[PDB]
Design a protein around this ligand. Structure first.
Ligand code: HEM
Ligand code: NO2
Ligand code: NO2
Ligand code: NO2
Ligand code: NO2
Ligand code: NO2
Ligand code: NO2
Ligand code: NO2
Length: 154
């Protein structure tokens, strides 16, 4: 559960490379999630009509969304676990407005790791992927606890 500082530094070193082009990494991650787990795309009323990866790549609104998502996760990871304030509104919206089960949070965690593994082998070898997995597990564990407080079974 609690990450060491060395683990957080591996997380934030690969995140630094994401931040060279957040919009590009958000397209790759959302696309990989929708292609790997098509049922997740059904949660997005604004995007669920998109039929192909081409359409998804060409969607200016999907790209803006990817930037929103990754910048919110970035701000969470930069808290190195002290993320209670940031998780409150995110848990509430994803529980009550969007109804995102923890299993779908696991799917997007898998999509993040796939994309960083593909793009960043210089900063995402086994130890670094292990540290990112632990950070994402922590995030899901803390969101699951907030979901239960908010009444949503997740
Ligand atoms: C790393 C995990 C995730 C983060 C950091 C994240 C972040 C965000 C943020 C910041 C927003 C905009 C503000 C809000 O409504 O809260 C948003 C909207 C949304 N999220 Fe997520 N999200 C995550 C995972 C998911 C997953 C896995 C799904 C669905 C399978 C999902 C579905 C949505 C929907 C449907 C919206 C509204 C999109 C729209 O404006 O049309 N989220 N998310
Ligand atoms: O102290 N590195 O986990
Ligand atoms: O869309 N900027 O977080
Ligand atoms: O794509 N997460 O909103
Ligand atoms: O730190 N949990 O919200
Ligand atoms: O609580 N956000 O929809
Ligand atoms: O996107 N999951 O390998
Ligand atoms: O990824 N080999 O450390």
């Amino acid at each position: 559960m609690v990450l060491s500082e060395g683990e957080w530094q591996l997380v934030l070193h690969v995140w630094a490379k994401v931040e060279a082009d957040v919009a590009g990494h958000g397209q790759d991650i959302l696309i990989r999630l929708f292609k790997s787990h098509p049922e997740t795309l059904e949660k997005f009323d604004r995007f669920k009509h998109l039929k192909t990866e081409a359409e998804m790549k060409a969607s200016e609104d999907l790209k803006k969304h990817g930037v929103t998502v990754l910048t919110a996760l970035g701000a969470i990871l930069k808290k190195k676990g002290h993320h209670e304030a940031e998780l409150k509104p995110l848990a509430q919206s994803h529980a009550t407005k969007h109804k995102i089960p923890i299993k779908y949070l696991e799917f997007i965690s898998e999509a993040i790791i796939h994309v960083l593994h593909s793009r960043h082998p210089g900063n995402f070898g086994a130890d670094a992927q292990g540290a990112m997995n632990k950070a994402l597990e922590l995030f899901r564990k803390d969101i699951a606890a907030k979901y239960k407080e908010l009444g949503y079974q997740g």
